[PDB]
Design a protein around this ligand. Structure first.
Ligand code: ANP
Ligand code: ANP
Ligand code: K
Ligand code: K
Ligand code: MG
Ligand code: MG
Lengths: 145, 609, 610, 316
């Protein structure tokens, strides 16, 4: 046995946001809106919004993300990786939108794969704080108590 | 391979039970009182088969006589007692429980529930005493003395110098110099009230008054969970509630149930009359274990009082905490299920539910926001005012009963008080169509309605936000013709306000008010935005005008005459916009500018140049 | 008479020590790693005096090899090992701690920090394992096998069927059918990241990849920083240490590493995060996690800080996860708050760093002024607010008294909803004329702190929203008394119209441009406090004062002498000025529909609508 | 005492809060500043209160002590006068804390002189010249003797210790009980004018109580008038009262027996400097097993109930 790393695991979250799929989709792409709920973002391109195959650092540079595929208010797939993570470890998070016009809500089905075994509970609790509750309190897309 | 056996280092194991466990030092009184109750149960079980055993000392009691002159805390009971051999085996061997050995030798279906199962509870008195003098007396033996200095050896001497007792055991606790607090009446009654308050046998305390000494029964209120809820009267429940909790008032409702099977446990849950703003204590073998259980009661249901007396709970060596066993969740769902059934029984009464809902309105609505499994059951208890219920409160099920056949949504409105929502201009639209609108006055109402989202198929719709109503074929063509006519007026109000509003549209849901502001059915309401901006521990607007108001008609006349950029039309636009914010529930930014506009209208009315 | 010796029931003591001591079942992994760390310290202490004792196994590691197909959780260490006699005396006897006897054999002042002190920590593995096959190997003996199943007896057999090991002990755990969760990679890493994260020796874990070669991963990748001097530690090491003690992603805003030497030996590395987490301070004894639910360790208003506290010497419990009647915590509580207050003062010396700290923890600092009493004066100097002279940046209370003139004896402030509402309030015109600085309070928690301090360097905190009296010359008091006496029927007219809406109507000279305003009667809830209490989810009389220099008030006075005390046109205007003053003073307007009807009637009057 | 600690390895605690009080009762008193013949003189007469922690511990044979007490004493004496002989005066000395690792320059002294006048300006340099150095050496010596008298009570002598590591580290009939009394001072942000009428006006009493049964048809409460509160469980009677200065009630709980009847004495201490009022409540006659129950409920049914119904102070 040689010195290496562990395996990978997966999670599945579904936070409910009170915002149409058109406005919520632009929240994860508009750089002017990203700085609102993140309070710190570093973009390398001069584009107004995020594009395909574009890397950008979040939360002081500790969170490295990259948009690899996205649909019109339907799909959002990002390559999520942490600063303290190793080189082979690189997770990919998928965001699927489901607009419910009867209740005026949007259940964002989040299919996150490629998370390390030991780093599972860390990226799940902080996702509800830096991504779920941060947007609900900045843009008013949900009641938090 | 040689097969050895496990040994035990007495000089070190004795210290492991003396100054390494029992984090708190008042535990010595509870375990000694519990040891007296087990001895009283042994002689009581033998009295049913042999009355001669209870003829020496027929009165069963537990006497505590503090002596501050010689620093001796004497605890005397009239139990079965210990012989000369029991003082060496049952009281001289670590982890040897003679009480557990007596329970395993009983018959099938016994009514006695003793406490002693571990066998190391007697060595807890050394926390406050340097040496103990145990005086025992059995029916089939003589009276002996068990002396030890918490070391590695003890002596057993025949009692020939102390007072002769009939039957039982006398424990003389020579308290240390630093543990002299247990010789006063305050600390003695404090540990008993906390730990051994519900002992079946009376606990007598020798109290000196100002040198006439008397005996007071510390446990005045007998436990009620060992009795059927049928023969328990009302005044017994009131006295029991004032003992488990320090409340002075009587309990509003009592929910006494019993679950049988593989998890037999008793629980008497009390609902107070006023909010206490844990509360549910845990009891095992008539002994208080702890009350810091967080998974036993939900956070929104933490207002209920009472105790839970279970029997199958894995206790640690200190009997002050519970180990993880995936069983508290079963008791958790049973408590909520019985309390929800209890809340439904209170709803059957009118005078009883009025006091319960008015005192715990925040707690009931908090469960709708937090709990999800029983969210529909808690919605049945929600009571609010409405246009047809301005006098009393009505439920959600009564709302659907009065809904016409052409209504498909439950309409409500949020605000700061009842007087603000009863005069809101958003009610004139629904009152014309005979639509009942609920009134939400508490800040927690919006948090509950944003999680239910549906009641019996009816979608909860807030009239404060943007919504749509039904309209005939004759009106859909007239409204479209009037909206396109007022199109330049909507654009005239947009560039004046600018970023203050999202869009200016002509709305027909207004009859008396000339203008109003809505949220947009996706953002935070006017009340929700005001709530978040006022919490100590912690949206776009739509300008809609009424085309039938005479003020709006006059503003429309100024547009076609080239008055889209006049000074007087800009003053009235900002005045009417900020006025609608006060009616819709919004807060005015820089209220000094709004007051300066009103002062100028006052001068115009008073003929001031 | 007869003297006997205390005995022990072995058949019943084993059940009590194993089943009824530890709350959780995952504690078994912490004691086995702690025992491996103690054995590694014994061979390390002997290597300094005998290098040949470390030649058989020079690598000091802790390897864990789970076997799901065999239901075996193997824990191998490279410690000193146990001889044939130690497997019977040390490991065979309950409450016999051989590592404690090793600590007592050396002289006082060594560099040993072993964990084993009780002697009943080894039996905790039986909570999850049915039978054990602990294999040991010492340098001064052969390799033996210690087999037992917690049945009151054990056997020691010479090892001849297992692989030869150089030095150390191999712990073979045959887990039960219901405790097979400890064979996966997830459950193993959770216990290590919770109880034995900061072990000085590397903890190796044998994981199995997918096609599927098995490799070794070091679970404790971060080394403890409290064992080093805070001067030698750089900023990069403090950031990685903060990401290990907590699950946060960002770097710590400030690091406070101190060490108290004397009667109480304890160290603490406290981190200040960049955002509020809305416990947090963990306690470590012998570099082993004990508990994190200590309430007497850190105040609730100060619980926002992160970090751990190394307090190697403390009274531990038999379960070894709770402290006994913590009177030492009060000594550590006062030391942690003292060091954090001194740390907050060091942040206040900077300008760019304190802006991020105050903007993120404004509520926590003000909660200390409301709750804490002994350190209320120290936290009052950290409060930063806006004022009429500090509209650009936040100013402190110390800088406030520096700019105070010689004729000012009180600190003036004002509360409200936001900054835009308090900057244009009509209450500032009186203080701006006398060159008096007024602080601006925008957060709802500001009022709860000012009603508890009540004094800053002898200056009494007064709220301009309430009824207060200013100092003026004697000739001004004479001319003002005549105007109040002249406007006496005007004040009596406004009182009967409003009725019980106000307590009294008096002529106030603290208003310059506004026609009237509303103040509280110096007792009760203020305008902002009353609105906040009526808006909490989990949860006073008014004074009508008019300005004698406003043209509207002078016109209303002209109507009084003409018999217009009961005119219909005046009653509408006095009610209009009352509800308008409530909006400027910060009061909640009752039934705004009627107030909107008065505005709609004024708009129609201006548009020539009959 | 008998301590069963082999080789003194386990933590054994010994509370010494009782002996610490008796030690300060014989060391802080009798010490004087100057002499009676000089125009300036002062001397402590008694200790006001000794609150805090004073415990000795041992881990590996070293006697550790982490005491932390709040010491306050009463001081008398006389100062120089312009006319006639010297004039006496009274005062009090307040110490913030006396720790174990406190140096000579760390001990603070809050000077609290009664009847502060311009003539008594020389009273502060008096105690700071000879009295304060006498108090510093006593506080410093308090740590030395504390380890000397209670240090031998634990850490059994080395004759029975076989550990070199620890050795190198050593240097009647049935009746009832008696009564008791409690004392609290809740703070209210309200003048004594309406705070007095809050406990008397029946229309205002029903506000912060929501349940009351008055037997008389009087507008407000009068002397020798009984009335039940909280569903008839709280029976109190007004027997004496002064104009916004004193309030005496005969508080009694329904669960209490007949020979038990407590008495509440309320005193108003309104201060116009901070616009507040400290209501000193001297509650006596409570049973010994009921003083903690009536005290915790007084902060909920009497203190917070008034501050939330009428708004006489903000609580969080
Ligand atoms: N007051 C008493 N009168 C008679 N027998 C007693 C008395 N106290 C103790 N004993 C005996 O001493 C035995 C030892 O009990 P003890 O050491 O207190 O532990 P336990 O009560 O059996 N279980 P636990 O208290 O949870 O550790 C009991 O089983 C009794 O047989
Ligand atoms: N991995 C190991 N290698 C060598 N010796 C060991 C090992 N594990 C246990 N021992 C021995 O077993 C003895 C008994 O220790 P144990 O029963 O684990 O409790 P303890 O470590 O002594 N005290 P505590 O860990 O606080 O409960 C120790 O003194 C060691 O000598
Ligand atoms: K026993
Ligand atoms: K052992
Ligand atoms: Mg016992
Ligand atoms: Mg161990």
């Amino acid at each position: 046995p040689q010195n290496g790393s562990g395996n990978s695991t997966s999670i599945y979250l579904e936070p409910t946001f009170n915002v149409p799929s058109s406005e919520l989709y632009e929240t994860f792409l508009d750089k002017q809106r990203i700085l609102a709920w993140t309070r710190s973002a570093q973009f390398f391109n001069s584009g107004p919004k995020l594009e395909t195959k574009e890397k950008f650092e979040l939360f002081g540079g500790n969170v490295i993300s990259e948009l690899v595929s996205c649909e019109k208010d339907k799909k959002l797939v990002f390559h999520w990786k942490l600063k303290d993570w190793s080189a082979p470890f690189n997770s990919t998070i998928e965001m699927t939108f489901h607009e419910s016009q009867e209740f005026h809500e949007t259940k964002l089905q989040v299919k996150w794969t490629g998370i390390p075994v030991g780093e599972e509970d860390r990226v799940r609790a902080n996702f509800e704080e830096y991504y779920v509750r941060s947007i609900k309190l900045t843009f008013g897309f949900g009641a938090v108590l | 391979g040689e097969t050895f056996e496990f040994q035990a280092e007495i000089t070190q194991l004795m210290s492991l039970i003396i100054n390494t466990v029992y984090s708190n030092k008042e535990i010595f009184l509870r375990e000694l009182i519990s040891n007296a109750s087990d001895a009283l149960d042994k002689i009581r079980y033998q009295a049913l088969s042999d009355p001669k055993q209870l003829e020496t000392e027929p009165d069963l009691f537990i006497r505590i006589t503090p002596k501050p002159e010689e620093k001796v805390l004497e605890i005397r009971d009239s139990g079965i007692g210990m012989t000369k051999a029991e003082l060496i085996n049952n009281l001289g061997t670590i982890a040897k429980s003679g009480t557990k050995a007596f329970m395993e030798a009983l018959s099938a279906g016994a009514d006695v529930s003793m406490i002693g199962q571990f066998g190391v509870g007697f060595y807890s008195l050394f926390l406050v005493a340097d040496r103990v003098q145990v005086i025992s007396k059995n029916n089939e033996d003589e009276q002996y003395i068990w002396e030890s200095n918490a070391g590695g050896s003890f002596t057993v001497t025949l009692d020939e110098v102390n007072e002769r007792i009939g039957r039982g055991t006398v424990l003389r606790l020579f308290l240390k110099d630093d543990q002299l607090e247990y010789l006063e009446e305050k600390r003695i009654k404090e540990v008993i009230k906390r730990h051994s308050e519900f002992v079946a046998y009376p606990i007598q305390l020798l109290v000196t008054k100002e040198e006439v000494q008397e005996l007071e029964e510390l446990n005045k209120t007998k436990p009620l969970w060992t009795r059927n809820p049928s023969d328990i009267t009302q005044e017994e429940y009131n006295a029991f509630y004032k003992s488990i909790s320090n409340d002075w008032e009587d309990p509003l409702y009592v929910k006494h149930f019993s679950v049988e099977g593989q998890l037999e446990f008793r629980a008497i849950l009390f609902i107070p009359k006023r909010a206490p703003f844990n509360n549910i204590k845990l009891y095992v073998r008539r002994v208080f274990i702890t009350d810091e259980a967080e998974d036993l009661i939900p956070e929104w249901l933490s207002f209920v009082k009472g105790v839970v007396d279970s029997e199958d709970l894995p206790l640690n060596l200190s009997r002050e905490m519970l180990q993880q066993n995936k069983i508290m969740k079963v008791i958790r769902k049973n408590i909520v299920k019985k309390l929800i059934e209890a809340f439904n029984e209170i709803a059957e009464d009118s005078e009883q539910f009025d006091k319960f809902y008015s005192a715990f309105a925040k707690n009931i609505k908090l469960g709708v926001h937090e709990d999800t499994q029983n969210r529909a059951a808690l919605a049945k208890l929600l009571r609010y005012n409405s246009t047809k219920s301005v006098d009393e409160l009505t439920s959600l099920t009564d709302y659907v009963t009065r809904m016409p056949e052409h209504q498909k949504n439950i309409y409500y409105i949020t605000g700061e008080s009842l007087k603000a929502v009863e005069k809101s201009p958003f009610l004139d639209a629904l009152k014309a169509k005979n639509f009942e609108v609920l009134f939400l006055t508490d800040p927690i109402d919006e948090y509950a309605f944003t999680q239910l989202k549906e009641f019996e198929g009816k979608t909860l719709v807030d009239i404060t936000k943007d919504f749509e109503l039904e309209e005939t074929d004759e009106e859909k063509a007239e409204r479209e013709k009037e909206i396109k006519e007022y199109e330049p007026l909507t654009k005239a109000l947009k560039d004046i306000l600018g970023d203050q509003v999202e869009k200016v549209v002509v709305s027909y849901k207004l009859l008396d008010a000339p203008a109003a502001i809505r949220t947009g059915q996706f953002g935070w309401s006017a009340n929700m935005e005001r709530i978040m901006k006022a919490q100590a521990l912690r949206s776009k607007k739509t300008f809609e005008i009424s085309p039938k108001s005479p003020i709006i008609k006059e503003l429309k006349k100024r547009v076609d005459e080239g008055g889209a950029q006049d000074k007087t039309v800009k003053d009235l636009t900002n005045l009417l916009f900020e006025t609608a914010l006060l009616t819709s529930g919004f807060s005015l930014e820089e209220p000094t500018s709004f007051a300066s506009r009103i002062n100028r209208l006052i001068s115009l009315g008073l003929n001031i140049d």
